[PDB]
Amino acid sequence: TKCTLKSFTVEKGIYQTSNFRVQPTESIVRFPNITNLCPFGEVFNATRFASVYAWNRKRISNCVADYSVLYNSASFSTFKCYGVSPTKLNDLCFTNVYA
Amino acid sequence: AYTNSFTRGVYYPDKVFRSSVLHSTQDLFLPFFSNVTWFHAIHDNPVLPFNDGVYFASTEKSNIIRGWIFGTTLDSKTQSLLIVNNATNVVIKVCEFQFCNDPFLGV
Amino acid sequence: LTGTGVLTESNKKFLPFQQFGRDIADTTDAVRDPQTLEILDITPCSFGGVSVITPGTNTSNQVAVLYQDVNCTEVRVYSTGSNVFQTRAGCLIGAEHVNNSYECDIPIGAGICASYQTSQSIIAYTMSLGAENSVAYSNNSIAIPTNFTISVTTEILPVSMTKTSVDCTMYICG
Amino acid sequence: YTMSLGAENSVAYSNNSIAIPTNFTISVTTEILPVSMTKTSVDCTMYICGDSTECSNLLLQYGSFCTQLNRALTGIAVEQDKNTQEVFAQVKQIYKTPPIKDFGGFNFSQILPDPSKPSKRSFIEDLLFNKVTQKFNGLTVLPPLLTDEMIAQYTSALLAGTITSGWTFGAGAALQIPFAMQMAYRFNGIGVTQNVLYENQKLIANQFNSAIGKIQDSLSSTASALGKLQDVVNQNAQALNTLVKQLSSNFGAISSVLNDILSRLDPPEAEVQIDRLITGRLQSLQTYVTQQLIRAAEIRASANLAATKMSECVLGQSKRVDFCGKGYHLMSFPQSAPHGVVFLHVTYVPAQEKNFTTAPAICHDGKAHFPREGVFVSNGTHWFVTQRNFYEPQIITTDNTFVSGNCDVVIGIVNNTVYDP
Amino acid sequence: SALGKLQDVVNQNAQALNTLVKQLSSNFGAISSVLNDILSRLDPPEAEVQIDRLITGRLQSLQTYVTQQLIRAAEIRASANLAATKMSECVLGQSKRVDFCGKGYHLMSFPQSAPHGVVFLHVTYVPAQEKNFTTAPAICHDGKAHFPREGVFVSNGTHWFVTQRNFYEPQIITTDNTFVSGNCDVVIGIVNNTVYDP
Numbered sequence A: 001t002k003c004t005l006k007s008f009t010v011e012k013g014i015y016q017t018s019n020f021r022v023q024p025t026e027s028i029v030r031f032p033n034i035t036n037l038c039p040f041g042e043v044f045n046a047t048r049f050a051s052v053y054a055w056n057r058k059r060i061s062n063c064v065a066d067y068s069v070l071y072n073s074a075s076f077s078t079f080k081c082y083g084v085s086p087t088k089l090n091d092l093c094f095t096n097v098y099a
Numbered sequence B: 001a002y003t004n005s006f007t008r009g010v011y012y013p014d015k016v017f018r019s020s021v022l023h024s025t026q027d028l029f030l031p032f033f034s035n036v037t038w039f040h041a042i043h044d045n046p047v048l049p050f051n052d053g054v055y056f057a058s059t060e061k062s063n064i065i066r067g068w069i070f071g072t073t074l075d076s077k078t079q080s081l082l083i084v085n086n087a088t089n090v091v092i093k094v095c096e097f098q099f100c101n102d103p104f105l106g107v
Numbered sequence C: 001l002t003g004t005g006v007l008t009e010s011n012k013k014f015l016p017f018q019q020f021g022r023d024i025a026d027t028t029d030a031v032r033d034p035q036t037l038e039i040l041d042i043t044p045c046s047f048g049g050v051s052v053i054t055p056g057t058n059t060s061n062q063v064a065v066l067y068q069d070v071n072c073t074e075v076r077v078y079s080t081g082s083n084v085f086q087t088r089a090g091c092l093i094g095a096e097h098v099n100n101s102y103e104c105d106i107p108i109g110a111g112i113c114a115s116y117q118t119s120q121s122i123i124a125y126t127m128s129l130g131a132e133n134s135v136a137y138s139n140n141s142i143a144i145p146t147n148f149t150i151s152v153t154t155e156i157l158p159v160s161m162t163k164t165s166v167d168c169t170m171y172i173c174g
Numbered sequence D: 001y002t003m004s005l006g007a008e009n010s011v012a013y014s015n016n017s018i019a020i021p022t023n024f025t026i027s028v029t030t031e032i033l034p035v036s037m038t039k040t041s042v043d044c045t046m047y048i049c050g051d052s053t054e055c056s057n058l059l060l061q062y063g064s065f066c067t068q069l070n071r072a073l074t075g076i077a078v079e080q081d082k083n084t085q086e087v088f089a090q091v092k093q094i095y096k097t098p099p100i101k102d103f104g105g106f107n108f109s110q111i112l113p114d115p116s117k118p119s120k121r122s123f124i125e126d127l128l129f130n131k132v133t134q135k136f137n138g139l140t141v142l143p144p145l146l147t148d149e150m151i152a153q154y155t156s157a158l159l160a161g162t163i164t165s166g167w168t169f170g171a172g173a174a175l176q177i178p179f180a181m182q183m184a185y186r187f188n189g190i191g192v193t194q195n196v197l198y199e200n201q202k203l204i205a206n207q208f209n210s211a212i213g214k215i216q217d218s219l220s221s222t223a224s225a226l227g228k229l230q231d232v233v234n235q236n237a238q239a240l241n242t243l244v245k246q247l248s249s250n251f252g253a254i255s256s257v258l259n260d261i262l263s264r265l266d267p268p269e270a271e272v273q274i275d276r277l278i279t280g281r282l283q284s285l286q287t288y289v290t291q292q293l294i295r296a297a298e299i300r301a302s303a304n305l306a307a308t309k310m311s312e313c314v315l316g317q318s319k320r321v322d323f324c325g326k327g328y329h330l331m332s333f334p335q336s337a338p339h340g341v342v343f344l345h346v347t348y349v350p351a352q353e354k355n356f357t358t359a360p361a362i363c364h365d366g367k368a369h370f371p372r373e374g375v376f377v378s379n380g381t382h383w384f385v386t387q388r389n390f391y392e393p394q395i396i397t398t399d400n401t402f403v404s405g406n407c408d409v410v411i412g413i414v415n416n417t418v419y420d421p
Numbered sequence E: 001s002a003l004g005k006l007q008d009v010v011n012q013n014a015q016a017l018n019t020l021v022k023q024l025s026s027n028f029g030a031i032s033s034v035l036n037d038i039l040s041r042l043d044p045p046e047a048e049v050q051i052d053r054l055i056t057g058r059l060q061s062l063q064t065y066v067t068q069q070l071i072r073a074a075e076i077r078a079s080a081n082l083a084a085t086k087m088s089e090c091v092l093g094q095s096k097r098v099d100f101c102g103k104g105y106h107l108m109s110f111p112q113s114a115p116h117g118v119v120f121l122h123v124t125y126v127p128a129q130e131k132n133f134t135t136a137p138a139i140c141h142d143g144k145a146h147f148p149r150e151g152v153f154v155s156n157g158t159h160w161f162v163t164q165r166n167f168y169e170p171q172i173i174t175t176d177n178t179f180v181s182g183n184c185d186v187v188i189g190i191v192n193n194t195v196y197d198p
């Protein structure tokens, strides 16, 4: 109450000073139970790519990837992301993927 | 021939669960009480425009309607989506199929 | 998708393609556990307003705590024992419940008021509306005053308020 | 169509014709006034930055914007209970009618709390309560200080005081008086001689009871009864629903969901998007609070009017025209309603009239005689003096008229004789 | 505390100004609440942005202050209108409005000035002591029903008198206290007595 009213003296009455909220005791981390790798190796380091007019589309599914070794790679002349930060990437468990 | 679509053509706009709520959303829906063309398959399988999306409806008792073809020329010159449902197997292909002058499947 | 809350069982029959639920405010209502295909509701970690009922610091440093619109169940220093009084305003902890009614002093709500009384402590009670006084009504009896009193009362009304003026230019861009 | 402004009714005006009612009706009207509004409370910190440490730390840059809105809403909530106290808590005691309900034939069983029912609430109050109809999201509702039962007890005390002591319980001590004599005073207060009440006591009592029955029927059938309190409840619910919906707006951000921004953007951009959401939600809160302050001022003005009616209508007798219903005010009865008060105004309305010939004064011996009370009328052969609000012809005597001036001054004075007892 | 209604008003205005002054310490997203520290550190392309944020925040604070002052001023205006009505119908006249000019039957009022307000001293008549008397709506004499012109009929157990409603002062029942209307067969509760003829 003293902090809420910014005074070391509190007049007689009822004051609304805070909100009771139970605090968490432990964190709950939930992700799909899958222990596979992504085909990024054969997609980036592929032997031959397709022409731009016939651009190739490679769906991905049930895999886990570490885009930190790609962002830290000088091999890639351009690494730009839109709608999602390239740094904070290993947090949000991705949903759809089309390379 | 045309008939009244009444209130058909409503689908879940996304994959988010909602309950006890009135939600306003803008998307490609079938207008209410619009005219829908009625085709017959007795005693006639023309090609119809797709425009910006198509609502399709069928009434069945013996699974007469078994597939759909989508494209522009349907003559192996461009890509055309082919969907066929044979008994228990749904098959989807996007090959450059060479279609007959009047595509059909025999029994 | 991150957040803080209590995960509980639900009876919401999610469709196989639906993963998250939302409330009126568009916040997350429930999730499907990615490991076990069950639907769990997410209820924010039970909360409510906390009000402090206190006499002035010129009288006492003892206080009572009102937990608004909660049950005396879910409830560092202030524990959940001694005198706990459940009212229609919430769970009041630290105020002693007194059966005797009095005139309302520190209002709590829903007919409950608190005061500092007797050795002294904060008490909570149902407020009195006034003394009970039946009228001796009958079809042939009238009470007529035989004496009178001339009284003078004080009624105070605001008329004006400080004529403030703000130099908006100097205030914003002095 | 072009709306009508009412029926056309010419008045048969002439310089020597007066219409005086020969019969009357006792009417009861319902006036509904808001007294209080839902005591809302907004947790500004949880509303803007719910369970987000980063958002709260960014909110800290807006200073007292949060606590001053909490202060404004607290002030509103407090003044709502002040409004309720001003309207209902105008009696220092809590009177209670005795079991004998033989109030000169006036039936009050539909307005006095039913003993059988647990909560002291009248039948009409029960009808009224059946007509007026965010949880985990910061927005809370505080309860009123006075419960519906306590409001019912205050209205019961005020009604019992009015019935058993007239206006005496308001000014000072409650002085018991037979209800018929109370009504005799109420009739004298409107320019109708008290003997009219006693001669028509059974008729007046039956008219009052029928009016109460009609009020019960109207409130038990028509669904558009409490249109002034239901509109207030609807306005408060709509304001809260709009405030809740405002959380779904982007305000220029990539998403309205704070957790979806926090999990997707780096601090240098997440802080900007959060600043946009904080600005939008703080502006929404300020708009809500301003609208609540204006609505609260309207409610306070309505509550002050309701308290004025309570004091000058229930506790006394009002001489203010159409302040306490159409007609000549006799008495009023308070009833509670959700977030409001309903006044049952019992008024005297002239019902039937006759065209009489009149004159401002009568000459007897050259003196001009004027009525002390009432006016002179003639049925064509004899002149009488009668009270203005009820046709009751009396013989013209020296106890009905007084002498002032002479016959050569008054325009329209007529010749007659004045009987000397 | 007797003058709290006015002291709270003063406090509210002081509190509003103090809040406005405190609003100068807020950043509103800027690197610093101090305008001079921004001006001395940033080039126009960034200083203009930080200043735009501070201007937006301070202008919103001023608008909030002004809106609160307008609402409070409307409340004060309503109170002033009530005070003027009380002056006109309470000090300058005599009020028949129940509890408008204090509890009791209003006699007179006296104005007093006060800081940013007015104090009315309401002098009222309040009944103090009462007795239980038997009453009747009318008295029969020759079959006619006699009603009081003013006041009511009371009985102390042996004699009937007529007295003013607001003060016990029994008087002999005479033709100058009562009037005749109707007859004894109409009035419910009429009692037999005599009316003195001077």
Ligand SMILES: *[C@@H]1O[C@H](CO)[C@@H](O[C@@H]2O[C@H](CO)[C@@H](O)[C@H](O)[C@H]2NC(C)=O)[C@H](O)[C@H]1NC(C)=O
Residues within 6 Å of the ligand: C147, C148, C149, E128
């Ligand atoms: C009417 O009331 C007044 C005061 O309310 C009475 O005046 C007091 O009377 C007592 C004894 O009767 C004296 O001891 C006091 O000194 C009086 N006070 C004043 C200020 O005069 C008055 O006597 C009462 N009259 C009746 C008839 O009861």
Ligand SMILES: *[C@@H]1O[C@H](CO)[C@@H](O[C@@H]2O[C@H](CO)[C@@H](O)[C@H](O)[C@H]2NC(C)=O)[C@H](O)[C@H]1NC(C)=O
Residues within 6 Å of the ligand: D107, D108, D109, D110
């Ligand atoms: C006063 O009015 C009430 C209701 O209008 C009367 O109670 C009703 O009495 C009749 C028989 O006289 C019953 O059939 C009804 O069921 C009663 N109503 C209820 C709600 O129970 C009451 O009798 C009236 N009193 C007088 C003295 O006339």
Ligand SMILES: *[C@@H]1O[C@H](CO)[C@@H](O[C@@H]2O[C@H](CO)[C@@H](O)[C@H](O)[C@H]2NC(C)=O)[C@H](O)[C@H]1NC(C)=O
Residues within 6 Å of the ligand: D022, D023, D024, D025, D203, D206, D207, D351
């Ligand atoms: C004055 O009006 C009242 C009603 O407004 C009349 O009372 C009605 O009289 C009729 C016939 O005498 C009865 O059938 C009704 O039941 C009465 N109503 C009530 C409520 O009792 C009254 O008779 C009229 N008097 C005059 C002189 O016109």
Ligand SMILES: *[C@@H]1O[C@H](CO)[C@@H](O[C@@H]2O[C@H](CO)[C@@H](O)[C@H](O)[C@H]2NC(C)=O)[C@H](O)[C@H]1NC(C)=O
Residues within 6 Å of the ligand: D379, D380, D381, D382
């Ligand atoms: C005007 O009123 C007077 C007073 O009642 C009427 O005079 C009486 O009329 C009745 C009618 O039956 C006679 O029985 C009385 O003998 C009359 N008394 C007197 C003193 O005249 C008069 O008739 C009324 N006139 C009209 C036109 O209604």
Ligand SMILES: *[C@@H]1O[C@H](CO)[C@@H](O[C@@H]2O[C@H](CO)[C@@H](O)[C@H](O)[C@H]2NC(C)=O)[C@H](O)[C@H]1NC(C)=O
Residues within 6 Å of the ligand: D363, D413, D414, D415
């Ligand atoms: C009322 O009565 C008076 C007297 O009874 C009338 O005055 C008379 O008027 C005529 C007309 O000029 C004179 O000739 C008489 O001499 C007057 N009488 C007296 C005593 O002076 C008066 O005109 C009457 N008015 C009406 C309207 O009838």
Ligand SMILES: *[C@@H]1O[C@H](CO)[C@@H](O[C@@H]2O[C@H](CO)[C@@H](O)[C@H](O)[C@H]2NC(C)=O)[C@H](O)[C@H]1NC(C)=O
Residues within 6 Å of the ligand: E156, E157, E158, E159
């Ligand atoms: C009711 O009031 C009357 C009027 O004063 C009382 O009558 C007088 O009472 C006194 C008592 O001391 C006698 O001395 C008078 O002679 C009485 N006068 C008459 C004309 O009767 C009467 O006593 C009062 N009744 C009661 C019960 O007190």
Ligand SMILES: *[C@@H]1O[C@H](CO)[C@@H](O[C@@H]2O[C@H](CO)[C@@H](O)[C@H](O)[C@H]2NC(C)=O)[C@H](O)[C@H]1NC(C)=O
Residues within 6 Å of the ligand: E140, E190, E191, E192
């Ligand atoms: C008041 O007095 C009258 C007469 O003075 C009483 O009327 C009498 O009532 C009885 C009972 O019915 C009749 O037998 C008499 O004939 C009536 N008298 C006359 C003259 O008709 C009346 O009852 C008295 N009322 C009270 C309450 O005492």
Ligand SMILES: *[C@@H]1O[C@H](CO)[C@@H](O)[C@H](O)[C@H]1NC(C)=O
Residues within 6 Å of the ligand: A040, A041, A042, A044, A045
């Ligand atoms: C491609 O090969 C290089 C080494 O030749 C390696 O550093 C890089 O990580 C590879 N890329 C992927 C996606 O595996």
Ligand SMILES: *[C@@H]1O[C@H](CO)[C@@H](O)[C@H](O)[C@H]1NC(C)=O
Residues within 6 Å of the ligand: B002, B033, B034, B035
């Ligand atoms: C459907 O067609 C008919 C005639 O072809 C027309 O009258 C009707 O208005 C059409 N329906 C709509 C919704 O326009």
Ligand SMILES: *[C@@H]1O[C@H](CO)[C@@H](O)[C@H](O)[C@H]1NC(C)=O
Residues within 6 Å of the ligand: B086, B087, B088, B089, B091
């Ligand atoms: C449907 O056609 C596909 C394509 O050859 C075939 O593999 C499948 O077995 C067929 N199913 C049936 C039921 O005919």
Ligand SMILES: *[C@@H]1O[C@H](CO)[C@@H](O)[C@H](O)[C@H]1NC(C)=O
Residues within 6 Å of the ligand: C058
């Ligand atoms: C406490 O209150 C008393 C009177 O009630 C007053 O004299 C005294 O100065 C007050 N002290 C403080 C610190 O408020």
Ligand SMILES: *[C@@H]1O[C@H](CO)[C@@H](O)[C@H](O)[C@H]1NC(C)=O
Residues within 6 Å of the ligand: C070, C071, C072, C073, C086
């Ligand atoms: C609190 O919970 C208990 C049981 O858990 C229940 O009996 C009681 O009525 C509840 N009280 C309130 C105020 O919710």
Ligand SMILES: *[C@@H]1O[C@H](CO)[C@@H](O)[C@H](O)[C@H]1NC(C)=O
Residues within 6 Å of the ligand: C097, C098, C099
């Ligand atoms: C109050 O009265 C009730 C009886 O209704 C009793 O059960 C309870 O123990 C009493 N409490 C106190 C503190 O006296």
Ligand SMILES: *[C@@H]1O[C@H](CO)[C@@H](O)[C@H](O)[C@H]1NC(C)=O
Residues within 6 Å of the ligand: D012, D019, D353, D354, D355
């Ligand atoms: C008085 O006379 C006029 C003449 O037309 C008539 O219209 C009016 O109704 C009469 N008054 C009453 C009360 O009937």
Ligand SMILES: *[C@@H]1O[C@H](CO)[C@@H](O)[C@H](O)[C@H]1NC(C)=O
Residues within 6 Å of the ligand: D015, D016, D411, D412
């Ligand atoms: C009243 O009006 C009539 C209309 O003809 C007129 O003759 C008469 O003189 C008037 N009387 C007065 C006193 O104005």
Ligand SMILES: *[C@@H]1O[C@H](CO)[C@@H](O)[C@H](O)[C@H]1NC(C)=O
Residues within 6 Å of the ligand: C136, C143, E130, E131, E132
């Ligand atoms: C009138 O009689 C009632 C009956 O109980 C009593 O309570 C009341 O005090 C009496 N009034 C006076 C003034 O004596």
